[PDB]
């Protein structure tokens, strides 16, 4: 293609990252060429890296929470002008001609191409944002809002829209609503920020008192309930408009469906690889919903970023240099990060 980049790749299920040089494509008519400033780390990167889901193709450059600079723009693009600080999410392509793609629900396209570990329309293995540059179709790039900081808008490109997409789709953008956040991972954490920011009563549900300081002090949730403290669990019995169910492992749905009121939704966003249960007469009891959501579209990623700027959301990111990415992976695995990690990619890896 048109020139080379170096970035840090994984090349076996041990997931240890070391520099890897590769060729980027020629900036085609619709493409946008980006000089990556920083890239965020989150568990997807930890999962594909070490294989885990049994489907990793190596060499693999992670990073899907990308924010950089348009240095070059394809023959047709006009949204972006060179110089613009832009950002790239989990996807880099879709078929553009099926009903999800026309509806601007391209994350739901059957033929979506992922940031890395996939293969693009030209036959090339997609590589992440842990590199000094990337070329991305203009449809999968977003202008990061003006006051917004780069390492700030990078968690927001992944966990931001995963929460804001349902909160916007299920009509839950309304002030007043009562929500539960079951699970305090990354998506959970953002749940308590975007929900609380939309004007919602946010109750964080867990299983131990470890996330009390986090949910109540650092997240500002209105009270914390242990999913096993039956006293307070029953006072909640028909008060919640929705539940953002974030737990990745198998759990009983019925205790959480129980907190829900008439027409209440349980939005599931952790992948439980084993079939979850529900007792059918209780969904009938409250015209309750069991649903799910896969990330966000690009229209919603604009919306969400704009929203967090307006409402001034601020996650507590920890910015590390690229030689630290392996210990940063060890710690993100042992949950030793003070909430999020952002790799400063202008803390470079020059390897021609």
User: Residue ranges for the binding site for Zn(2+)?
Assistant: 42, 64-65, 95, 98, 101, 109, 158
**Residue 278 found at the interface with its own copies (CB under 8 A):** yes
What's the min distance (Å) between Cβ of 102 and Zn ion? 8
Which of 233, 231, 222, 170 minimizes the C-alpha distance to 199?
Answer: 222
**Residue 289 found at the interface with Zn ion (CB under 5 A):** no
Torsion of CA 222, 226, 232, 235, to 10 degrees: 70
**Structure-block tokens of residue 194:** 């975007």
**Residue 271 found at the interface with its own copies (CB under 8 A):** yes
**Residue 279 found at the interface with its own copies (CB under 8 A):** yes
| Closer to Zn ion by Cβ: residue 101 or 181 | 101
Residues near 16 by Cβ (< 8 Å), separated by ≥ 6? 10, 326
What's the min distance (Å) between Cβ of 14 and its own copies? 26
| Contact status, residue 160 vs residue 306, Cβ threshold 8 Å | no
How far is it, in rounded angstroms, from Cα 105 to Cα 297? 5
31 phi/psi in degrees, rounded to 5: -75, 160
**Residue 299 found at the interface with its own copies (CB under 8 A):** no
| Subset of residues 221 to 260 that bind its own copies, contact rule: CB under 8 A | 238, 254
- The rounded Cα 156 to chain-centroid distance in angstroms is 7
| Subset of residues 141 to 200 that bind its own copies, contact rule: CB under 8 A | 169
Stretch that binds its own copies, among 98-106, 177-185, 329-337, 344-352 (CB under 8 A): 98-106
**Residue 95 found at the interface with Zn ion (CB under 5 A):** yes
How far is it, in rounded angstroms, from Cα 352 to Cα 328? 25
| Contact status, residue 242 vs residue 195, Cβ threshold 8 Å | no
Alpha helices, H only, 145-244? 150-153, 159-169, 187-197, 212, 230-235
Residue ranges at the known binding site for NADP(+)? 44, 162, 183-188, 206-211, 246, 270, 293-295
**Residue 261 found at the interface with its own copies (CB under 8 A):** yes
Stretch that binds Zn ion, among 70-78, 105-113, 123-131, 137-145 (CB under 5 A): 105-113
* Interface pick for Zn ion out of 101, 154, 204, 328 (rule CB under 5 A): 101
What's the min distance (Å) between Cβ of 256 and its own copies? 14
Show the CA angle centred on residue 17, arms to residues 14 and 22, nearest 5°: 120
Which of 162, 239, 172 minimizes the C-alpha distance to 200?
Answer: 172
**Structure-block tokens of residue 129:** 């944002």
What's the min distance (Å) between Cβ of 322 and its own copies? 32
Q: What 8-state DSSP symbol labels residue 213?
A: I
What's the min distance (Å) between Cβ of 240 and its own copies? 13
What's the min distance (Å) between Cβ of 95 and its own copies? 13
* Interface pick for its own copies out of 289, 319, 324, 331 (rule CB under 8 A): 289
Residue 283, contacted partner among Zn ion, its own copies, none, CB below 5-8 A by kind: its own copies
**Residue 280 found at the interface with its own copies (CB under 8 A):** yes
Which of 47, 49, 44 minimizes the C-alpha distance to 61?
Answer: 49
How far is it, in rounded angstroms, from Cα 33 to Cα 28? 10
- The rounded Cα 321 to chain-centroid distance in angstroms is 21
The binding track of 50-89 with respect to its own copies, each residue x by CB under 8 A or -, is ----------------------------------------
Which residues sit at the interface with Zn ion, rule CB under 5 A?
A: 42, 65, 94-95, 98, 101, 109, 158
Which residues sit at the interface with its own copies, rule CB under 8 A?
A: 99-100, 103, 105, 108, 110, 169, 238, 254, 261-262, 268-273, 275-281, 283-294
């Amino acid at each position: 293609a048109e020139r080379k980049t170096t970035g840090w790749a994984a090349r076996d299920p041990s997931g240890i990252l070391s520099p890897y040089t590769y060729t980027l494509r020629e900036t085609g008519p619709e493409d946008v060429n980006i000089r990556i400033i920083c890239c965020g780390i989150c568990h997807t990167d930890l999962h594909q890296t070490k294989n885990d889901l049994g489907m990793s193709n190596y060499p693999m450059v992670p990073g899907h929470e990308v924010v950089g600079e348009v240095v070059e723009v394809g023959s047709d693009v006009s949204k972006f002008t060179v110089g613009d600080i832009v950002g790239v999410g989990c996807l880099v392509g879709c078929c553009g001609g099926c009903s999800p793609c026309e509806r601007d629900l391209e994350q739901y396209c059957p033929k979506k191409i992922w940031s890395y570990n996939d293969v693009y329309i030209n036959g090339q293995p997609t590589q992440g944002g842990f590199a000094k540059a990337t070329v991305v179709h203009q449809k999968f790039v977003v202008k990061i809002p003006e006051g917004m900081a780069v390492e700030q808008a990078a968690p927001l490109l992944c966990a931001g829209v995963t929460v804001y997409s349902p909160l916007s789709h299920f009509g839950l953008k309304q002030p007043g609503l009562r929500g539960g956040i079951l699970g305090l991972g990354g998506v959970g954490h953002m749940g308590v920020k975007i929900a609380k920011a939309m004007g919602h009563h946010v109750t964080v549900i867990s299983s131990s008192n470890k996330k009390r300081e986090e949910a109540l002090q650092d997240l500002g949730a209105d009270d914390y309930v242990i999913g096993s403290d039956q006293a307070k669990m029953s006072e909640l019995a028909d008060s919640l408009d929705y539940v953002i169910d974030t737990v990745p492992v198998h759990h009983a749905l019925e205790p959480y469906l129980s907190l829900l009121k008439l027409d209440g939704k349980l939005i599931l966003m952790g992948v439980i690889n084993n079939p979850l249960q529900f007792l059918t007469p209780l969904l009938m009891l409250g015209r309750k919903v069991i649903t799910g959501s896969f990330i966000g579209s690009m229209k919603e990623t604009e919306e969400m970023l704009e929203f967090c700027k307006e409402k001034g959301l601020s996650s507590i990111i920890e910015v590390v240099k690229m030689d630290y990415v392996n210990t940063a992976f060890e710690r993100l695995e042992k949950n030793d990060v003070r909430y999020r990690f952002v790799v400063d990619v202008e803390g470079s890896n020059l390897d021609a």
